[PDB]
């Protein structure tokens, strides 16, 4: 859909649409910009757009999970001005914190 345009996403159109849809949306498409609209500036540009905003889409798709899970912590010692009397320890994320 947003394919014929000189980088209209600009790392903004992706924080709107959820990440599971567009990969199905791209398959339905038929051709690219029939005038070479934004390929003048390197396609690495639209790449540094899509691949930097896909993570924002994933984060808004995820944000419901930090509540469906326990807030994760550090895994090293990370010597802290209040570690005395309780030397900090790591934790290996292997369990299933998704609450049932």
């Amino acid at each position: 859909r947003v394919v014929f345009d000189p980088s209209n996403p600009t790392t903004f159109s992706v924080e709107a649409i959820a990440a599971y849809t567009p990969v199905a949306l791209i398959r339905l498409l038929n051709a690219s910009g029939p005038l070479q609209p934004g390929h003048r500036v390197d396609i690495a540009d639209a790449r540094s757009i899509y691949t930097v905003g896909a993570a924002a889409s994933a984060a808004r798709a995820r944000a419901n999970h930090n509540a469906n899970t326990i807030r994760r912590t550090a895994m090293f010692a990370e010597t802290d001005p209040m570690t005395w009397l309780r030397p900090t320890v790591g934790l290996k994320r292997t369990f299933n914190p998704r609450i049932i």
């Binding site: 398959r27 540094s48 899509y50 691949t51 999970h65 469906n68 895994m75 994320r93 914190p97």
Partner: protein, 481 residues
């Protein structure tokens, strides 16, 4: 090349290497040397184009006693002196042996593992958060194929055995990795009795001089960190070092990168490693070494001995084309659970990410189908923290230094030894070259460095590998000049 393939035939026997008809026989004068023809009036790489100059002989040193041409030190002598040495030390059982072998000689390697092994790019942080998915993958591989995976990195082996041998994997499938690590531990420990300690001269103490894997000026073909260089500064204090990063002498580095300032096409002599896992974060201490030299002297012994002897020659590295993996790694399909519901485990539920409902064309979730893995949202969405760390590009670097103090004379310093190697690259297994479900020339491209990594079956993957070219690759290790 195709005019007089020279220095190429090494099938000859000593009976024939000494024949009065050998056009090479006139060039064997000092066992500690190697004579040859070369262009004159050149001292360094210069351009990639060899200028015009009448032929001229130069002087290069033969470092290892394995350098000797085959029809002077036959195979039999070497693999018998091995028995003389390897008497009663660690020998790996037929179980683990058959396992790792069948692993190597199987073209069924799930490409997904290459992907994951690459995108983690060595940091500790992007491992201790992905652990679930890794155990799931390794289990779903071994427990159906009886073939271990993750034998394409030493970082990976010492990241598994350090934190995954506590029962999260079967007792025998992790016993395999434990055995593989203790074998190379014994292989380093063997060198201790072949040394006379206590004469540290020019830094290179006894432990480090007689052996290349004990040298910290010559580096493995593949690395992700800068530990090689941070130990290299301690050496070469008199050995006249030489660096070259994609056209530039110096090199610049950062502590860690973000997901924003991507620049798929960085031009500079820049390098990045993962992260300072403790300490500070910015411009107070610029660079921090990842580990101790013991991690280094143990790093490349693996690469230089073990992987070769296992692949039996069918190993060839491939430089990564990341511009379609980090873009493709963020095409995940994670289904959430209602707040009051449980989590499926069978592939018979419409909220199992491998259900027959969630298959979407051109989705990262097609790989796990093609390789028949097991996944959940907890183990899947734990991947997308690549914003804190993401390795940009894999390059090749030319480094060099003088010979040791052991061969330090007034005529030897002008015979420098050059060293090239890929950074953030990848060592790969037997190549398939007969699959279609994935686009070939899009994920990796072959860039050999070591004549141990010059397999010819690993060549058609390049765009336009015409038949009129594939004929000579079966004769020479092709290496970019």
């Amino acid at each position: 090349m195709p005019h007089h393939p020279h220095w190429v035939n090494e099938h000859l026997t000593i009976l024939q290497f000494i024949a009065p008809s050998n056009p090479r026989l006139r060039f064997e004068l000092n066992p500690a040397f190697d004579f040859f023809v070369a262009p004159g009036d050149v001292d360094l790489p210069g351009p990639q184009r060899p200028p015009e100059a009448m032929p001229t002989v130069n002087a290069t040193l033969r470092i290892i006693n394995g350098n000797i041409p085959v029809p002077l030190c036959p195979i039999s002598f070497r693999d018998c002196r091995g028995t003389q040495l390897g008497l009663g030390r660690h020998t790996m059982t037929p179980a683990t042996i058959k396992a790792v072998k069948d692993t190597f000689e199987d073209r069924a390697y799930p490409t997904i593992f290459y992907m994951l092994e690459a995108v983690i790019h060595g940091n500790e942080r992007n491992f201790c958060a992905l652990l679930r998915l890794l155990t799931q993958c390794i289990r779903g591989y071994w427990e159906q194929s009886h073939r271990v995976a993750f034998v394409n990195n030493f970082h990976m082996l010492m990241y598994i055995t350090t934190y995954l041998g506590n029962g999260e994997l079967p007792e025998v499938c992790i016993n395999i990795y434990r055995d593989l690590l203790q074998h190379v531990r014994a292989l380093r420990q063997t060198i201790t009795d072949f040394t006379i300690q206590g004469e540290g001269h020019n830094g290179e103490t006894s432990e480090a001089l007689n052996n290349i894997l004990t040298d910290d000026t010559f580096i493995a073909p593949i690395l992700w960190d800068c530990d090689a260089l941070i130990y290299r500064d301690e050496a070469a204090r008199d050995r006249l070092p030489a660096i070259r990063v994609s056209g530039r002498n110096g090199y610049q580095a950062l502590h860690f990168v973000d997901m924003a300032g991507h620049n798929f096409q960085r031009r500079d002599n820049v390098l990045i490693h993962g992260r300072p896992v403790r300490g500070d974060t910015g411009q107070g201490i610029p660079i921090t070494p990842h580990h101790d030299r013991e991690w280094g002297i143990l790093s490349k012994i693996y690469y230089y001995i073990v992987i070769p002897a296992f692949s039996r020659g069918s190993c060839c590295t491939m430089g990564v084309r990341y511009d379609r993996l980090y873009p493709a790694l963020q095409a995940v399909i994670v289904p959430e659970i209602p707040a009051d519901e449980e989590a499926p485990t069978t592939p018979e539920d419409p909220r199992h990410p491998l259900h027959a409902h969630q298959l979407v064309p051109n989705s990262l979730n097609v790989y796990f189908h093609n390789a028949h893995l097991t996944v959940d949202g907890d183990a899947l969405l734990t991947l997308q923290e690549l914003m804190g760390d993401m390795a940009e590009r894999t390059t090749a670097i030319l480094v060099s230094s003088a010979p040791d103090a052991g061969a330090a004379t007034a005529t030897t310093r002008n015979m420098r030894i050059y060293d090239g190697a890929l950074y953030h690259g990848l060592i790969m297994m037997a190549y398939q070259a007969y699959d279609e479900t994935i686009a070939t020339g899009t994920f990796f491209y072959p860039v050999p460095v070591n004549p141990l990594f010059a397999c010819p079956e690993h060549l058609a993957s390049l765009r336009g590998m015409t038949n009129a070219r594939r004929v000579l690759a079966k004769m020479v290790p092709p290496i970019p000049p």
